[PDB]
Design a protein around this ligand. Sequence first.
Ligand code: NAG
Ligand code: NAG
Ligand code: NAG
Ligand code: NAG
Ligand code: NAG
Ligand code: NAG
Lengths: 198, 596
Amino acid sequence: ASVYAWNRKRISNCVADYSVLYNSASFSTFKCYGVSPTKLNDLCFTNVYADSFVIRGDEVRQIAPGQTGKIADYNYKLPDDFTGCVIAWNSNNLDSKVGGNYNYLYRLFRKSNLKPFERDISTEIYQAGSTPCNGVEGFNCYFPLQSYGFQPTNGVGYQPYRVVVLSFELLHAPATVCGPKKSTNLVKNKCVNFNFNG
Amino acid sequence: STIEEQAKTFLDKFNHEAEDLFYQSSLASWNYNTNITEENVQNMNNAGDKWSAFLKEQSTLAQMYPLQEIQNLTVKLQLQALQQNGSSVLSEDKSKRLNTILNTMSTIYSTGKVCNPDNPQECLLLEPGLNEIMANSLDYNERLWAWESWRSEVGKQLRPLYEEYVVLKNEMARANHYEDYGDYWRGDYEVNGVDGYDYSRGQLIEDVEHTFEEIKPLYEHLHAYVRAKLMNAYPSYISPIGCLPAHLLGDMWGRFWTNLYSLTVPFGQKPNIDVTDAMVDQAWDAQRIFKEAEKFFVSVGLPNMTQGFWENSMLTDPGNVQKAVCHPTAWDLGKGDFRILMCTKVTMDDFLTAHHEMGHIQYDMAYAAQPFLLRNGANEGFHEAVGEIMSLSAATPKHLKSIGLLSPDFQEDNETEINFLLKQALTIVGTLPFTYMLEKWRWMVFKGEIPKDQWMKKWWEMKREIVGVVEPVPHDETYCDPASLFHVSNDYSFIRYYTRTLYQFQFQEALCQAAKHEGPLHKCDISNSTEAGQKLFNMLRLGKSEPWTLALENVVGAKNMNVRPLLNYFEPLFTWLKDQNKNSFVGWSTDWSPYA
Ligand SMILES: *[C@@H]1O[C@H](CO)[C@@H](O)[C@H](O)[C@H]1NC(C)=O
Ligand SMILES: *[C@@H]1O[C@H](CO)[C@@H](O)[C@H](O)[C@H]1NC(C)=O
Ligand SMILES: *[C@@H]1O[C@H](CO)[C@@H](O)[C@H](O)[C@H]1NC(C)=O
Ligand SMILES: *[C@@H]1O[C@H](CO)[C@@H](O)[C@H](O)[C@H]1NC(C)=O
Ligand SMILES: *[C@@H]1O[C@H](CO)[C@@H](O)[C@H](O)[C@H]1NC(C)=O
Ligand SMILES: *[C@@H]1O[C@H](CO)[C@@H](O)[C@H](O)[C@H]1NC(C)=O
């Protein structure tokens, strides 16, 4: 999805294996805020929010708590007290075409900054001036959604990066997104410490 | 809400749209330059027309925001850059006439072919047909024939065109609230609104004269030495008291004197520092040349080249089937795309040019964080100067020994330093009076100090007075002798080379003082010094966001262009030239004593 209309998938009622993601060599950014990757595979959470979008290379830094920029203020805002991980990887192979891939949009102007975990899909003309826009893009009135130019010959700070942000929250409901239950081979006829289903 | 926020949002919209449109235009220009084919020419023309129409529409939108209600310096700089009319203030008929005149001058210069009357079956173009003759011949009348025939054909074609050009450009400039087109060119160095660091358009000419008055003794001694050597080369043509004949300077126009190094060498018996054979023996590819240049730039602490640079640049001549422009050019295409288009040979000149163009690439990469319309040099001099400092540092024997290209048992005595400094003076010092005289003549033409019927009588008078070069035979007003050069026929500013030459040695002294070099300035190498790279990158990261005076304060600690680093660079050579000019006469006479 575009960063203005970022996809949110709620992940529930399954086992989340985080070691598969962490040990992959295909990801450029795996920055976790509020939790460490080593204990993710053990802990259990009520729900997982997976937000997916595409941004530029230079805009990956703005996907963090406390940051300022076009993406943070007008497209995707993260809370300061955020627990989760930001995973980003280069997608110049898929999201760039020789003619130029203009299928990715971003919101350029909004009157106020976004709240955390807010999606703005409004396509109303931004009013920067005293004059009424009247729905037409003229003078002091600009269309807020602008297309990204993705070419395969661009620099790494302008190449498209696919970003998936995982948000971990604990609510009073029973936590069902748990980490892998690791098992070992069964040994019989010896005095051992057994752990069977807790 | 406020006017400043309106301008900031408009500038954001302009930056985001303009960067993609400029990338498309630049990619089309690249595809034309690496592949000269008619569809690439059509794509370039379409992209350029779209880019120019977009700039017209954005300037039209930009003018509705008045300048004096904005206090932020960067926003005011971008609005000042955008709100320039350009040719749009001129009428559509005169704008079309000016564009037609520029295009036909480009075709006349590019496709100008001149050969001897009564032998017309084949003819030679300027590059490389006439360049090789001017740079390598030792015959007086052959060079005289080539010079007079090319200025006859080119000047007699271009003189009415230039007479229309000066009037149209003056009309456009006075329609843009400038005094003349010379004031329009001098407005690149104009700084307004900064406390203390303001620079005026009228201060530029005074500073150029003030620096040239200190240039003049060194150039007089160099001219006397070159006159004595050319008297040895050509026995009877050159007078001891007069100026040099125009067609004997080693180039077509007198732009550089570097092709007279064979004739004017001090110590021919001593060896040269030529490293060409050493690269040929070790089979150094152009890829190895650029990797050694990258090693030089990582040694000083600057960032290394991108992956897209190595993937997308053309560092070798493609072949017979594919046509490309042979001139070395570094391209900042936009959106982090940096390329070098050079037909690199295994020579010292191509190696120094590779360092120069990778310096251009480093300069372009440094201000990538800046907004789009501020992605330039602080003036036109800095952009070339940061490449010329790399050309200075890479040419040193210490750099060649460090990278293994020179023998470690090469004896560095004073004679090799004298002849190397003389070669660098013939390249660098010799272009300064020609540049100053040409720009002062063009300024007086645009200002109206010189009437159209008196252009050449004054011009040769200027050339005898400043350059010390006499015409072979007198020229009337049917000739157009200045416009045979590339930059003047194609509407380019020429004071950038003068400012580049002075900024080159100012930056060289600043980085060598940063690197704590304890010897002569020409023996200095800026490799292995992180602090020199940091001092460079402090100015490099600014781009066009800050004034060039403040950038010069950031590098050298001075608020103005200075001439003393150049004189300090050539001071051993200056003493040697003063010793060698005891018998001969320093200075020239403006009379017709050699030949007319
Ligand atoms: C240059 O152009 C020719 C003909 O237009 C084409 O066949 C060739 O592939 C081009 N070269 C490159 C490197 O694309
Ligand atoms: C000027 O504007 C730029 C970007 O619009 C901003 O980063 C900078 O802080 C501003 N400077 C001042 C003095 O307001
Ligand atoms: C550009 O031309 C228009 C038309 O006359 C004029 O109103 C405007 O002031 C010009 N721009 C500048 C910066 O002078
Ligand atoms: C440039 O330097 C970085 C860090 O030193 C390195 O990771 C990268 O591979 C270098 N680029 C190239 C093309 O070697
Ligand atoms: C080089 O130094 C020697 C010894 O000091 C001296 O005799 C000679 O003239 C010098 N040559 C030059 C060109 O300075
Ligand atoms: C600069 O650093 C490189 C990297 O090791 C080294 O090879 C070179 O010799 C150094 N320069 C000097 C003058 O020692």
